[PDB]
Design the sequence.
């Protein structure tokens, strides 16, 4: 929420705390980061549309900052100066080595390790469109999304961490609470992604 | 994984023991906090009494010529004074009293007549003239150290006239008339009953032969007895304990039914037939080794009849004036000790003060209405021998007061337990501490009857071989909260408690913890 | 995470220990290597394309410094004078004995132990480029990626270590914690590789 | 003003735990007389806090021996008053439950 | 979860002690009720005697 109610809730729940608010702040921030590193991506982590321009003869394109994983039913889009566009395809490096030396429009790419590579290599500067999942520390919206939605996970995990530090039993209980909450949010993600889609074969 | 410890098993001030093995509630280092039945208490606070000497206050004393009268004498260089009505001074001997005497006089009580003796001046007594004067037939050549009293026998002293100040005693009196010294005193002449006796011994008999209904006894450096049952030459010179010697003149034995004795070596209690140290393994070491007094004298002890306590004012090394600034307190009703810290002070005694406004009243009226006989006041405290302290840095004296405030400033209080018995709790309710297992704190909660806040400091230490190190925690007002949170881990556990409060009532406390490793260093 | 919040976290969670900072350091370092030796490999350890220059008349090729394994989808490529090349194929040494005593461009590559081998012997000077996972230290990257990615795994595992040396019970609690994180990490890695590729049965 | 109430140890006599806050259940009194006596109930937040008072209607012992009330405080206080020809108090029993810990 | 307390161990009128630590049957504040062997008793009631000054 407003980052204050959360702190006072943490203080009240774990035994009417008075002065550990500094440790509260330090360890709380840590929580948001930890959760982000975890295999799951909630919807409100999704970044807005991005674009980039790359110079001629440079088939290597570095990863966008704060990137984690691309959007599944989204894909890399090539935008031309005439307003016309196209969506490039993805293949493993191996499949795509063949084109080494074919000039023209870009068509494919590979994730590789940290840099994007397009084997159809243009001879001029060119613009790209991209979408991906980004950390909250690196998004351009004013407020941190995590506080607003899923506060509870955030309340619990910091407490689980805070309580586990002092070697206290209830650590397992709070960890179970956090696990239940995470399963709930994982269900809720699919609740929205496939909310009202209509499908038919072809 | 928690230990609750309480402070009403009534252990004393115990710094000499192995501090880690101290039982529950034992004190490592104390600051003028009183251990009582209900728990730790504050024994401090002082009202301002009405007496005023307007001169140097070295020795003070209380006496009365009649019921309802209160008189005090303040003695100094060249000077002794009076404290009565609203005028002082003008009681000292005719000449300048003697050459800059200071903390070297003495006062004794015999019947109703007040007696004073000084090292550098002949003894003068007070009579109806209001001027201290020498004894009637005592020759002028004499000069005296210390004087004492006994059954109808004044001047049970031990110093000769001059050139022989070393080892003496003379039965100066005869069967005296109550209220006046015997008409003669002659010892060598066989007119009646008097004489001079050596009482051989290595040491010098220093002061009064003390007290006791059956007889009085004292020592040069081994105790000696006096008993007047015989008739040929009355009294029977005899001795009791060779070993025990006493260090200071004002290191006096108490007037209690039991005798409270302080020695060079130890602190012993007896009444003539059986002896024992009051606190051998508990208090003996710290009292002497707090500092080499190095000003052996000016260490005096008085009694507190109201509450079963006795105070031994002793110098602090930090103190440099030679003033005690500190006092050792022991309870005679129950074997518990306590220690106090105070402002610099010179001497103390007990008595009473009855002062009020008197001659400036409004109605000049006739004697058919009641004065009320000087009505009102501490009429209750007239039975109460409240103590009076000659504080070095004040013109007016003060008396103790339950509210722990000096005059308008407040007096400090510190409570320290260096280490706690914390760890495995066995079959018995009381726990036993395991050194091998290093441990982490969880929380602290204190049982207190008051409402005023108290600050808390936390100490930590690596190993027992290591020293102690300190940390401070913010206080908490007991009204709203009883717990404080902190995180730390050390070898042994230390908390330091300080309080600037009107009243402090400590009852018990509980500590939560967990075994999370073993000893490293 | 800045290699300093790690030691602070270790002290805080371990129980606010103070004077072990050197020990903490020794251990964190001991740890990153251990995890690196592990059989699983995360996704940030693939090196930038590195190439090697080979002298004629020699078949064996030294392995790159601190090598761990090849890339599943990338292969040795030779770049000729014209700039183009061909993808070499690998086979067990036994199957490659046949081309012994033959003439041409290289064609087959075999692992041996420390040395790659080229049995079609290149009679002249030659070069190949590879894509391989490498030890963390060797990689140029200004900073340790392990510090950025899954710092929680790192925190947990070192804590276990000291605690094991401290013969305290909760060593396991931490060990188990490492595991969840490790599993999750594998999920992220597997989740990311296939993020936007479309497969066809041909 | 306060009763030794709480954990009962190996010995028959109980020992009171301050840390655990507790809830009342019921009261029953052992009396030889027949005349009724009134009962007042006191509650207090913490030992540092003072005492506060509440009143409960009396019960004639002839028909009933128990009274029901619900409350929770730091320490437990009951105040007994009697305008009766004869008062014979013997013993009493208190039912309770540990349902939390000390707050203030 | 219940405590039964009795009043025949014969403790006196004990206001000075730490009142919370008082043993079973001890009295905090009393009003003219007599502690006896069987239990608490009323010691009161007055006949009118024949004297008249």
Sequence:
């Amino acid at each position: 929420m407003d980052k204050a109610t959360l702190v006072k809730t943490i203080a009240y729940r774990m035994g009417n705390v008075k002065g550990q608010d500094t440790a509260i702040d330090f360890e709380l921030a840590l929580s948001i980061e930890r959760l982000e590193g975890q295999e799951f991506v909630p919807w409100f982590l999704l970044s807005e549309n991005n674009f980039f321009e790359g110079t001629a003869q440079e088939n290597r394109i570095p990863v966008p900052r704060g990137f984690i994983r691309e959007y599944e039913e989204g894909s890399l889009y090539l935008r031309r100066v005439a307003g016309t566009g196209k969506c490039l395809i993805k293949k493993s490096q191996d499949q795509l080595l063949k084109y080494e030396g074919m000039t023209g429009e870009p068509s494919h790419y590979s994730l590789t390790n940290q840099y994007f590579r397009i084997y159809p290599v243009p001879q001029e500067d060119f613009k790209v469109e991209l979408l991906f999942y980004r950390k909250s520390s690196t998004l351009n919206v004013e407020d941190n999304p995590w506080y607003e939605y899923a506060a509870e996970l955030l309340v619990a995990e910091t407490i689980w961490a805070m309580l586990s530090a002092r070697r206290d039993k209830m650590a397992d209980y709070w960890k179970s609470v956090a696990a239940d909450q995470m399963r709930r949010l994982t269900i809720l993600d699919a609740e929205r992604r496939l909310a009202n889609q209509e499908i038919f074969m072809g | 994984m928690e230990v609750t410890h309480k402070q009403f098993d009534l252990s004393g001030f115990l710094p000499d023991q192995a501090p880690d093995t101290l039982k529950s509630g034992a004190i490592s280092r104390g600051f003028n906090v009183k251990p009582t039945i209900l728990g730790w208490e504050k024994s401090g606070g002082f009202r301002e009494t009405n007496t005023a000497p307007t001169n140097e206050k070295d020795f003070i004393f209380f006496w009365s010529p009649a019921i309802g009268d209160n008189r005090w004498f303040s003695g100094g260089d060249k000077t002794v004074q009076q404290v009565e009505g609203n005028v002082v001074s003008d009681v000292s001997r005719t000449g300048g009293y003697t050459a800059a005497a200071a903390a070297r006089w003495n006062a004794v009580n015999f019947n109703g007549v007040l007696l004073m003796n000084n090292e550098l001046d002949s003894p003068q007594y007070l009579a109806a003239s209001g001027k201290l004067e020498d004894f009637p037939n005592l020759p002028s050549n004499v000069r005296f150290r210390t004087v004492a009293v006994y059954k109808n026998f004044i001047l049970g002293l031990g110093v000769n006239f001059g050139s022989g100040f070393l080892d003496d005693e003379i039965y100066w009196s005869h069967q005296a008339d109550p209220g006046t010294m015997p008409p003669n005193w002659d010892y060598a002449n066989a007119a009646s009953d008097s004489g001079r006796t050596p009482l051989p011994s290595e040491g010098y008999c220093v002061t009064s032969e003390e007290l006791g209904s059956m007889n009085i006894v004292y020592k040069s450096d081994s105790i000696w007895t006096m008993q007047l049952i015989g008739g040929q030459w009355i009294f029977r010179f005899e001795n009791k304990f060779p070993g025990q010697g006493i260090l200071n003149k004002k290191s006096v034995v108490s007037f209690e039914g039991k005798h409270f004795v302080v020695t060079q070596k130890d602190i012993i209690v007896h009444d003539g037939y059986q002896v024992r140290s009051v606190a051998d393994k508990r208090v003996r070491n710290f009292f002497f080794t707090d500092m080499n007094s190095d000003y052996f004298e000016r260490v005096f002890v008085v009694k507190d009849p109201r509450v079963a306590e006795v105070y031994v004012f002793y110098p602090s090394k930090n103190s440099v004036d030679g003033l005690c600034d500190r006092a050792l307190v022991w309870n005679w009703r129950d074997d518990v000790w306590s220690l106090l810290n105070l402002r610099p002070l010179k001497h103390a005694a007990y008595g009473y003060e009855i002062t009020g406004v008197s001659i400036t009243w409004d109605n000049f009226v006739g004697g058919w209405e009641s004065t009320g006989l000087w009505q009102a006041d501490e009429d209750v405290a007239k039975y109460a021998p409240v103590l009076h302290y000659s504080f070095r840095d004040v013109p007016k004296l003060l008396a103790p007061t339950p509210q722990a405030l000096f005059i308008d400033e407040e007096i400090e209080a510190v409570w320290e337990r260096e280490d706690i018995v914390i760890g495995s709790i066995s079959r018995d309710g009381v726990p036993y501490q395991d050194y091998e297992r290093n441990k982490s704190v969880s929380s602290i909660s204190f049982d207190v009857d008051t409402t005023e806040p108290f600050d808390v400091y936390i100490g930590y230490k690596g190993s027992l071989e290591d020293s102690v190190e300190w940390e401070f925690a913010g206080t908490v007002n007991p009204m709203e909260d009883k717990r404080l949170f902190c995180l730390l881990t050390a070898g042994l556990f230390s908390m330091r408690i300080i309080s600037k409060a009107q009243t402090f009532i400590l009852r018990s406390y509980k500590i939560t913890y967990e075994f999370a490793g073993e000893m490293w260093a």
Summary: The radius of gyration of chain D is 15 Å. Chains D and C do not touch (no CB pair under 8 Å).
